[PDB]
């Protein structure tokens, strides 16, 4: 999840 | 100093970079998770991705009360998109299906260009009058690649000192590539083939996400500072926050015709004689006919099998 585009 | 167009999850905004203290204007509101953004200035179009609606949409920015219109659907994670304002095409990355795909501006004639050796593709930038496309991948093998805009001649151009390459843009006047790395906290530049790499902003950027350029100034969004920053594109000096308190800044462009300057479309007036897609190409005659996914191009190099 770090750096992932959230929601 | 130009207007800057940025995605902001719930909306797309424009802010004047000479006056980012003022509140941005909302170009399109009521969005769920707008992430990528780009435009075709001459056509009066703005495009964006929505990673919750799993779609690319567009709006007509010179019309009053023009709707949002879905042009591509079923995109699991459309983390990056770029508009080819010359060949009139729409390119995007998908970090869940691990693909780079193109279509016409209306979403028709979809063609997967790359589907191997992608892990976390993200930014994508085009040089239509040279027939090249550039993208980043922040996955297990972090890299910047370029290829023909027709899917030809794919090459890794940066694969060292790289970890979260999020932002990517071109300087069309100087023929330089610029990128921002959110793990290494910097902005670098290189020639278009990756050679002659140089640091611009050497460090101390918390979490840059997207990068654009206008005249002598770089502009980027930062996920940790919730702002747009700027600095000189040669020296990295003059680093200033120009617009802050942004809900969730995402992709960004300098919103100007001069960032999409006029050139001859090598497809001419008859779509290159191509039956389906006429894509920009880095080699003469500087277009290449192409067909939707799964469809074969006949021996003439122009007509897709009907
Ligand atoms: C035909 C028309 O209305 N064109 C306008 C143009 O004058 C303006 O510069 C641009 C950005 O505001 O929006 C569009
Ligand atoms: C993308 C675009 O509009 N490019 C135009 C080209 O179509 C046109 O033939 C030429 C006319 O001088 O100017 C340039
Ligand atoms: C999207 C357009 O961009 C430019 C402005 O001059 C117009 O008012 C409009 O905001
Ligand atoms: C009214 C005009 O249309 C729009 C802008 O991008 C121009 O700079 C101009 O001021
Ligand atoms: C670039 C802009 O395009 C349109 C016109 O409404 C503006 O006056 C300006 O020419
Ligand atoms: C040669 C011309 O160049 C440019 C395009 O916008 C036109 O459609 C044509 O392709």
UniProtKB/Swiss-Prot annotation, chain A:
This is Sclerostin. It is linked to Sclerosteosis 1: An autosomal recessive sclerosing bone dysplasia characterized by a generalized hyperostosis and sclerosis leading to a markedly thickened skull, with mandible, ribs, clavicles and all long bones also being affected. Due to narrowing of the foramina of the cranial nerves, facial nerve palsy, hearing loss and atrophy of the optic nerves can occur. Sclerosteosis is clinically and radiologically very similar to van Buchem disease, mainly differentiated by hand malformations and a large stature in sclerosteosis patients. Van Buchem disease: VBCH is an autosomal recessive sclerosing bone dysplasia characterized by endosteal hyperostosis of the mandible, skull, ribs, clavicles, and diaphyses of the long bones. Affected patients present a symmetrically increased thickness of bones, most frequently found as an enlarged jawbone, but also an enlargement of the skull, ribs, diaphysis of long bones, as well as tubular bones of hands and feet. The chain holds residues 115 to 121 of 213 of the full protein. It is found in: Secreted, Extracellular space, Extracellular matrix. Interacts with LRP4 (via the extracellular domain); the interaction facilitates the inhibition of Wnt signaling. Interacts with LRP5 (via the first two YWTD-EGF repeat domains); the interaction inhibits Wnt-mediated signaling. Interacts with LRP6. The gene is SOST. Belongs to the sclerostin family. Negative regulator of bone growth that acts through inhibition of Wnt signaling and bone formation. It comes from Homo sapiens. Widely expressed at low levels with highest levels in bone, cartilage, kidney, liver, bone marrow and primary osteoblasts differentiated for 21 days. Detected in the subendothelial layer of the aortic intima (at protein level).
UniProtKB/Swiss-Prot annotation, chain B:
Glycans are attached at residues 23, 62, 262. Residues 1-256 are annotated as: Beta-propeller 1. The lineage of its organism: Eukaryota, Metazoa, Chordata, Craniata, Vertebrata. Belongs to the LDLR family. LDL-receptor class B repeats lie at residues 44-87, 88-130, 131-174, 175-217, 218-257. Dual phosphorylation of cytoplasmic PPPSP motifs sequentially by GSK3 and CK1 is required for AXIN1-binding, and subsequent stabilization and activation of beta-catenin via preventing GSK3-mediated phosphorylation of beta-catenin. Phosphorylated, in vitro, by GRK5/6 within and outside the PPPSP motifs. Phosphorylation by GSK3B is induced by RPSO1 binding and inhibited by DKK1. Undergoes gamma-secretase-dependent regulated intramembrane proteolysis (RIP). The extracellular domain is first released by shedding, and then, through the action of gamma-secretase, the intracellular domain (ICD) is released into the cytoplasm where it is free to bind to GSK3B and to activate canonical Wnt signaling. It comes from the Eukaryota. The YWTD-EGF-like domains 1 and 2 are required for the interaction with Wnt-frizzled complex. The YWTD-EGF-like domains 3 and 4 are required for the interaction with DKK1. The PPPSP motifs play a central role in signal transduction by being phosphorylated, leading to activate the Wnt signaling pathway. Disulfide bonds join 267-278, 274-289, 291-304. It is linked to Coronary artery disease, autosomal dominant, 2: A common heart disease characterized by reduced or absent blood flow in one or more of the arteries that encircle and supply the heart. Its most important complication is acute myocardial infarction. Tooth agenesis, selective, 7: An autosomal dominant form of selective tooth agenesis, a common anomaly characterized by the congenital absence of one or more teeth. Selective tooth agenesis without associated systemic disorders has sometimes been divided into 2 types: oligodontia, defined as agenesis of 6 or more permanent teeth, and hypodontia, defined as agenesis of less than 6 teeth. The number in both cases does not include absence of third molars (wisdom teeth). The chain holds residues 20 to 325 of 1613 of the full protein. Component of the Wnt-Fzd-LRP5-LRP6 complex that triggers beta-catenin signaling through inducing aggregation of receptor-ligand complexes into ribosome-sized signalosomes. Cell-surface coreceptor of Wnt/beta-catenin signaling, which plays a pivotal role in bone formation. The Wnt-induced Fzd/LRP6 coreceptor complex recruits DVL1 polymers to the plasma membrane which, in turn, recruits the AXIN1/GSK3B-complex to the cell surface promoting the formation of signalosomes and inhibiting AXIN1/GSK3-mediated phosphorylation and destruction of beta-catenin. It comes from Homo sapiens. The gene is LRP6. Residues 263-305 form the EGF-like domain.
């Amino acid at each position: 999840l770090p750096n992932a585009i959230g929601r | 100093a130009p207007l800057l167009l940025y995605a902001n999850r719930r909306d797309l905004r424009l802010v004047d970079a000479t006056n980012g203290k003022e509140n941005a204007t909302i170009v399109v509101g009521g969005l769920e998770d707008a992430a990528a953004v780009d435009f075709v200035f001459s056509h009066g179009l703005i495009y964006w991705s929505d990673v919750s609606e799993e779609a690319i949409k567009r709006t007509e920015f010179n019309k009053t009360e023009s709707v949002q219109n879905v042009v591509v659907s079923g995109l699991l994670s459309p983390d990056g998109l770029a508009c080819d304002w010359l060949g009139e095409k729409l390119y995007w990355t998908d970090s869940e299906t691990n693909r780079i795909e193109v279509s016409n501006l209306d979403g028709s004639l979809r063609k997967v260009l790359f589907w191997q050796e992608l892990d976390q593709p993200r930014a994508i930038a085009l040089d239509p009058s040279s027939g090249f496309m550039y993208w980043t991948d922040w996955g297990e093998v972090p890299k910047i690649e370029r290829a023909g805009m027709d899917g030809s001649s794919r090459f890794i151009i940066i694969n060292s000192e790289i970890y979260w390459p999020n932002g990517l843009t071109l300087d069309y006047e100087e023929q330089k590539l610029y990128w921002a790395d959110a793990k290494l906290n910097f902005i670098h530049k290189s020639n278009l083939d990756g050679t002659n790499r140089q640091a611009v902003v050497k460090g101390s950027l918390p979490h840059p996400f997207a990068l654009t350029l206008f005249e002598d100034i770089l502009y980027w969004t930062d996920w940790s500072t919730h702002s747009i920053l700027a600095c000189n594109k040669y020296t990295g000096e003059g680093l200033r926050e120009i617009h802050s308190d942004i809900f969730s800044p995402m992709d960004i462009h300098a919103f100007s015709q001069q960032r999409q300057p006029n050139a001859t479309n090598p497809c001419g007036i008859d779509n290159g004689g191509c039956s389906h897609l006429c894509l920009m190409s880095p080699v003469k005659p500087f277009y290449q006919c192409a067909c939707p996914t799964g469809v074969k191009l006949l021996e003439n190099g122009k007509t897709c099998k009907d």
